[PDB]
Write a protein that binds this ligand. Sequence first.
Ligand SMILES: CCCCCCCCCCCCC/C=C/[C@@H](O)[C@H](CO)NC(=O)CCCCCCCCCCCCCCCCC
Lengths: 215, 293, 50, 336, 211
Amino acid sequence: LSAEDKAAVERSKMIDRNLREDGEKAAREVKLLLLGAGESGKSTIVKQMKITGIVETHFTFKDLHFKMFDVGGQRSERKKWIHCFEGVTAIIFCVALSDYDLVMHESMKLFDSICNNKWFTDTSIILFLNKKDLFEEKIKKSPLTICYPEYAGSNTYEEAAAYIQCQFEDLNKRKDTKEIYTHFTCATDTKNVQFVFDAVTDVIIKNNLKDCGLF
Amino acid sequence: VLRILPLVVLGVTFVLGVLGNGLVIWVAGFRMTRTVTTICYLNLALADFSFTATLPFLIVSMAMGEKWPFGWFLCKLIHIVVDINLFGSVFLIGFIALDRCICVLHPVWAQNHRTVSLAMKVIVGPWILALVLTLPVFLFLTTVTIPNGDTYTFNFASWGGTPEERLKVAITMLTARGIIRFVIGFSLPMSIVAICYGLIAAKIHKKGMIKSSRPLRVLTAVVASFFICWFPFQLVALLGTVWLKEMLFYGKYKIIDILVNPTSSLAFFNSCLNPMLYVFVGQDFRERLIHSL
Amino acid sequence: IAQARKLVEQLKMEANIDRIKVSKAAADLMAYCEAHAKEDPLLTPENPFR
Amino acid sequence: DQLRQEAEQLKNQIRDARKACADATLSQITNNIDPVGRIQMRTRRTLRGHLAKIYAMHWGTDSRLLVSASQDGKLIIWDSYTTNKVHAIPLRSSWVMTCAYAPSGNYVACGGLDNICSIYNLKTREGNVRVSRELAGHTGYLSCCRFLDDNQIVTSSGDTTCALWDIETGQQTTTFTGHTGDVMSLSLAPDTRLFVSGACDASAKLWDVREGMCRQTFTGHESDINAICFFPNGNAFATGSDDATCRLFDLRADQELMTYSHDNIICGITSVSFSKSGRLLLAGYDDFNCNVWDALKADRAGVLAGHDNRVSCLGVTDDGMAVATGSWDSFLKIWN
Amino acid sequence: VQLVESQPGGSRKGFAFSSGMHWVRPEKGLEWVAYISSGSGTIYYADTVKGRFTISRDDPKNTLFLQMTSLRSEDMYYCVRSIYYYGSSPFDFWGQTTLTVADIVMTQTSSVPVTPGESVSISCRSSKSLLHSNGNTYLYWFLQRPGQSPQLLIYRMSNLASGVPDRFSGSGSGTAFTLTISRLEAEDVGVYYCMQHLEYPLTFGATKLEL
Ligand SMILES: CCCCCCCCCCCCC/C=C/[C@@H](O)[C@H](CO)NC(=O)CCCCCCCCCCCCCCCCC
């Protein structure tokens, strides 16, 4: 039933074994997106982790292999390739608090689309708030009412931060099957990677429990 | 009066048991992608399915009152398969609990070092343990015809010699069987189950993460199911093992025996209850079944 | 912007075409389908995947 | 200036010339036709080995070798008859949209969000597969790649430009830029002298390789256009959009020859292909089923319904004796 | 591209190597001896020396050992590689090496003279059929110039190979097989051979085509 087809079948089985090994090595890793408005400090975020088209970065921390995909070069309609990342574990979303001098609410519009998009109905979002020192220095003079008229509160660091966080959070519509992890950081912090690690291990635990049927 | 209740329980375990266990064997290994969770479910389903297939002959034996209306080789095969499958089911419950505890308590090591290949290799351990524990029945189960009326256990007067020595050997073997049963098939598995599920509940309570009553309800359902379903049978088995002497040479305690069978029926209910509680709870499993048929 | 000029030039070229009536095209497509129907096993089921 | 006023006059004049062309209707033309019947097929060779979502496939010209690309980063060349694998190609980028196969069966093309087209060489004195030429020059992600011959390749990118390349020198020779949306698919002419490509701008354009300039446009959809393929007569093509509908276009008439829709279908269309006779307009939708429609009878009949996830790509053997469709289920199903 | 092969009763012992690789057999004919299947999966030996000749490969070391022992009087030898899959060209590259001490048969004709330019044709005789059910027929031709190495001029009696000028051809029908050269050149002299590959014992041929 075979003369050279015996050699064909072994070739096929050897490369099938190779495929399974490579697939297990691939499944060992965890995947994260990286979105922003351009002015957002995603460059500072990636610089914080130690070490044209789509650019990918690898890093490990406490024996966990992280792959991050940075889009932002594509100046096209996002909806056609946003479905390629339909199985990532988390999404990293960065906005700049120093958003009182742009040409702002645009990043909130970006957040709304990404936080209600049908592909990520059960994918967690890690919301990085950047440029807190510059935000404090700027808000010491500029008014919060310049951007937000409905706002009513003190011109204070903590009050403004809490208000901005609340307005970002309430954009979430599916908080039953979703979680937003919020963090304030700057260009001199070092615990941002640990915050990412805590969020990712929580998502991993959640997914394992949902597989096991206890959640 | 009392004899009707045990048979009625096993009848439900037969019709309903093979139903649920058949469904999971079809979805878990044939119509879903293969993962560690589905391979564990598949093995539990296989053990339960084989036990439910072995049930009806034992139903006939219980009705007819401890005598095979069937053959010698068939009787040996039925008993070996029922023992291997019961022990495999309990050990697989323990293994599933251990795997869930590992995943929930050490998420990092789980994602680094648990794959379908390693799971397939390691899943055979409990089966081998069940085989090496079921040896006695293969080595010393025989069909002995009562000279009085019928061909009704273990007697092994094969290496008998003096009946005085035969009785000592018999008592030793029976006590060893009872004690090894209680130590291995119930003490270890329920201890593992309780410890692991309590640990995962402690974690899920300490690190927030609780939204509804579903997690606690399902976890308490699994632990309470195992306990309330298996404890009476193992208790009566241990009491019989420790009172063998006075039951033989004097037959002082008969309640124990009037009890041996209904508790066994309650224990066999666990096999039917297991797939409905471990596999049917899954949302993705339910959706896959709904789409498949 | 010169983009409008390029668009206008392209539209002028598109206007310069001299199309045909759909009757001839439909007849041609029908003739094609009728002619090539013999060698289409997905219509009329030697097979290579036995 | 006043060019937009002139553009309105020309655009209005465009529709006028369009109206006078329809001397009859497809109903009148096809009044003498026997309906095909409730055509159904069965899966008979299931290819497996992919571990993630499949995106594109393409039969070779031997009608025996097909290549498929998934998100696992692997390019597998299958022997369709024995369902055994011939080569397995590791890719630099694990994000792939399209793949292609040379007419001589000696070269393979891959591309995705890495917006680089890479040619892989199969028939070598050495045993393994090496990368021959990499095509840089696009700014957006590549959606479709096809070969003219061993020396030329056409690509389409999210930059809304299509290009043609000479492989040996590795530089472009022609850009196609009249478009305004986001190009999704290319289909070469049977004689390889012209090609067509839809986009998100809801308009289909046909170009000409020698002069490198658009010569036809169509306005027949309310949303993005996903896939195109030439009618095997080289005088028509078909368009599949996100709006659950397909429409056929005749070039010598420059009008929508026919449409095909339904009420139950609400999902979009992912890929489209014809058969040898041109009777069957095979298309895979997003509702987990691949429909079979006759572009003349105008009544979809064939429910190709084997897959478990969304159908992503589908191709037809050059001898027209099978049909292969890969889906996000990570499987390749070949029907015959 | 590069494969150099390096007391009776005694004993003795590039390109992408990890992917069959056979062995082949004194002023006489030439035939098959033993082989491998890539990946060390399936191994067959010679039915005539089964037991005393050993084979072994080491991919990381990139070598090849043929442990021969208990030399009988039935004892050049050469190494050959065959990357085998669909549409492949196995046996496509031979090498050079003599150690001086119920199946199919492939019997060629002794010789025939020719003149340059004049067309020359060759035929061969087999024992059973070779048209396997899969669809193709297995037989390989090999020109061999004097003081040189055999070459895979044609495989599967229809397909040329790299470096082959396309003046050759091939054909077959059941048992009757042929081979033709249109314009014999200055480099077309030497004995031929053959090999059937349906039943794995590979019976080779005996044609010393003098000018
Ligand atoms: C492993 C987990 C689950 C296992 C599944 C099944 C196990 C359930 C219970 C464990 C073993 C019990 C099997 C059935 C036992 C009953 O029948 C009875 C109860 O002990 N057995 C005997 O009395 C023992 C003696 C039987 C009485 C018959 C006489 C034979 C020996 C007595 C000596 C006197 C007569 C000598 C020979 C008689 C024959 C002519």
